[PDB]
Amino acid sequence: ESRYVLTGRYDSAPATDGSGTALGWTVAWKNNYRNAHSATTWSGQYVGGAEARINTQWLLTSGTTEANAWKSTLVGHDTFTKVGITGTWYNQLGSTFIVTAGADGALTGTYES
Amino acid sequence: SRYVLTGRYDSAPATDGSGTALGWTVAWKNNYRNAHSATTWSGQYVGGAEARINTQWLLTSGTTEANAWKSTLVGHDTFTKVKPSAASGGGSAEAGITGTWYNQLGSTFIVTAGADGALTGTYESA
Amino acid sequence: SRYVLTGRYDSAPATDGSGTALGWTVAWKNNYRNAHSATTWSGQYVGGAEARINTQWLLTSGTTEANAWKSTLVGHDTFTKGITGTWYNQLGSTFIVTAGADGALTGTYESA
Amino acid sequence: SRYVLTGRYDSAPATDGSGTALGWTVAWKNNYRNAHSATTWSGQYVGGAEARINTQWLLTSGTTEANAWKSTLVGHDTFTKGITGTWYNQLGSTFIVTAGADGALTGTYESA
Numbered sequence: 001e002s003r004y005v006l007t008g009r010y011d012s013a014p015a016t017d018g019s020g021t022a023l024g025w026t027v028a029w030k031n032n033y034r035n036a037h038s039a040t041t042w043s044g045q046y047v048g049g050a051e052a053r054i055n056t057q058w059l060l061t062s063g064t065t066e067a068n069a070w071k072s073t074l075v076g077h078d079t080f081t082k083v084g085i086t087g088t089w090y091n092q093l094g095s096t097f098i099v100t101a102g103a104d105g106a107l108t109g110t111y112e113s
Numbered sequence: 114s115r116y117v118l119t120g121r122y123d124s125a126p127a128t129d130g131s132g133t134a135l136g137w138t139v140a141w142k143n144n145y146r147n148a149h150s151a152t153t154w155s156g157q158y159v160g161g162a163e164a165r166i167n168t169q170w171l172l173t174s175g176t177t178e179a180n181a182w183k184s185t186l187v188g189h190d191t192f193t194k195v196k197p198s199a200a201s202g203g204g205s206a207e208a209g210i211t212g213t214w215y216n217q218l219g220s221t222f223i224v225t226a227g228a229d230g231a232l233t234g235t236y237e238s239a
Numbered sequence: 240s241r242y243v244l245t246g247r248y249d250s251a252p253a254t255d256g257s258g259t260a261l262g263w264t265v266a267w268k269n270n271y272r273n274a275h276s277a278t279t280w281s282g283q284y285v286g287g288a289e290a291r292i293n294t295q296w297l298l299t300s301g302t303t304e305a306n307a308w309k310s311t312l313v314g315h316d317t318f319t320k321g322i323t324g325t326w327y328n329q330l331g332s333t334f335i336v337t338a339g340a341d342g343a344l345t346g347t348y349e350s351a
Numbered sequence: 352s353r354y355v356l357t358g359r360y361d362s363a364p365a366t367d368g369s370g371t372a373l374g375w376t377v378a379w380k381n382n383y384r385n386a387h388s389a390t391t392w393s394g395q396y397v398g399g400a401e402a403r404i405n406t407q408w409l410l411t412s413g414t415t416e417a418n419a420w421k422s423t424l425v426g427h428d429t430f431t432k433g434i435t436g437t438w439y440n441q442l443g444s445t446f447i448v449t450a451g452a453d454g455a456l457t458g459t460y461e462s463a
């Protein structure tokens with residue numbers, strides 16, 4: 001019930017100069033049980049090493065009438081650590097991110113809030 | 114040139130007049146170029162008299178840690194539907210979203226909405 | 240109704256056709272109401288036949304730590320009426336501002 | 352190396368445990384340098400043992416129309432030391448502020 005489909009993209013040929021790896025993904029907050037009529041997108045980068053991390057900023061847009069569109073979108077920032085990109089990650093809110101990074105640049109997985 | 118996109122949309126939107134929430138991502142790598150960055154668009158599909166996809170976006174570039182404070186640009190794009198621009202409105206979000214769109218910069222957004230929440234297609238910035 | 244705003248702007252902008260960087264804050268408290276929140280507009284002034292102030296804004300409400308993840312709204316406002324004057328945006332809010340030689344912005348904001 | 356800041360904050364915040372909404376602006380010009388940009392920080396003050404100011408910010412650079420699409424950076428800064436005082440963020444930047452009884456924020460900012 002708390003898990004939702006995610007899909008995204010990442011730079012499958014990142015710079016070799018110490019730069020992180022650019023990526024982003026989306027969750028539409030509808031599953032077979034619940035629907036919040038909203039979607040969040042996370043835009044960020046993967047930073048490998050001992051303390052592998054995914055540092056992001058996100059936009060959460062809710063479906064609204066035109067009259068309420070001015071307040072349709074929340075903005076925030078999430079940092080994820082692994083429990084490379086493929087794997088199970090957790091953020092500071094305790095949300096769980098299960099992800100697979102295809103060789104073609106695709107991000108597929110699930111998110112649980 | 115053209116880059117793959119993938120994303121998600123609310124496949125059972127509200128019926129109270131609210132728009133349909135959606136989002137998608139482009140990694141700016143194809144087989145010809147790589148900008149080492151990705152943009153995510155978060156927004157909603159609005160139907161009716163003036164169909165639009167209204168978005169805010171975040172463009173994150175790969176950077177060193179010292180430069181991570183400035184890795185992300187923010188902006189907003191409004192998309193107008195050009196193929197087909199004419200619609201009765203039947204088909205719900207899938208029909209409303211599916212097709213070719215252009216934003217205020219003249220970029221081209223070609224997307225298919227289906228399979229209960231999936232968005233696929235191509236993006237071409239101007 | 241009306242709220243105090245204060246801000247800053249680049250008092251010596253490039254002359255290469257670039258706009259003038261600026262920003263201002265409204266804390267949504269006046270004598271009669273308090274939404275326990277503040278909006279900041281970050282943007283640029285573009286002078287011309289039809290002068291414009293193009294902005295992105297962040298609206299942070301005071302929240303508990305538990306609700307801090309959803310404390311901040313983001314959006315964009317475009318204002319129509321160099322900087323000194325009365326402007327209105329696409330929601331019909333009224334921005335009344337004075338640009339000082341020091342880079343200061345002072346005025347009042349009234350949201351539709 | 353310092354730049355003037357001005358802003359606003361909620362001078363009568365909720366008493367429910369909520370933080371204090373605030374915002375401020377820096378136009379990046381002083382008497383020695385001008386980056387032709389402005390940053391606005393929007394966020395809230397959280398009192399207590401370890402007080403903090405948690406923010407999101409927008410840095411808008413003056414640009415020509417063609418470059419306007421990339422005019423604005425977005426980020427988040429967390430400051431540690433009431434609001435009046437000397438604060439530093441996670442970059443090592445220094446924020447020196449005075450919170451006025453009228454809801455004003457006045458001070459100087461120095462980026463790392």
Ligand SMILES: O=C(O)CCCC[C@@H]1SC[C@@H]2NC(=O)N[C@@H]21
Pocket residue numbers: 029036038039040058060062076078091093095113308
């Ligand atoms: O309230 C909704 O509309 C759905 C819940 C979304 C939870 C958000 S997405 C950004 C942030 N990061 C998380 O892990 N959870 C919140």
Ligand SMILES: O=C(O)CCCC[C@@H]1SC[C@@H]2NC(=O)N[C@@H]21
Pocket residue numbers: 141148149150151152170172174188190216218220237238239420
């Ligand atoms: O410069 C890059 O790193 C890749 C190109 C980014 C183009 C951006 S994405 C947001 C905005 N909307 C568009 O249609 N184009 C720009």
Ligand SMILES: O=C(O)CCCC[C@@H]1SC[C@@H]2NC(=O)N[C@@H]21
Pocket residue numbers: 070267274276278296298300314316328330332350351
């Ligand atoms: O609701 C609040 O917490 C205070 C009113 C906020 C109105 C917002 S500020 C950004 C946007 N631009 C406007 O003119 N109005 C809204």
Ligand SMILES: O=C(O)CCCC[C@@H]1SC[C@@H]2NC(=O)N[C@@H]21
Pocket residue numbers: 182379386387388389390408410426428440442444461462463
């Ligand atoms: O070069 C500029 O355009 C002006 C200096 C910008 C420094 C930025 S403001 C946001 C972030 N937080 C800081 O302490 N420094 C950077």
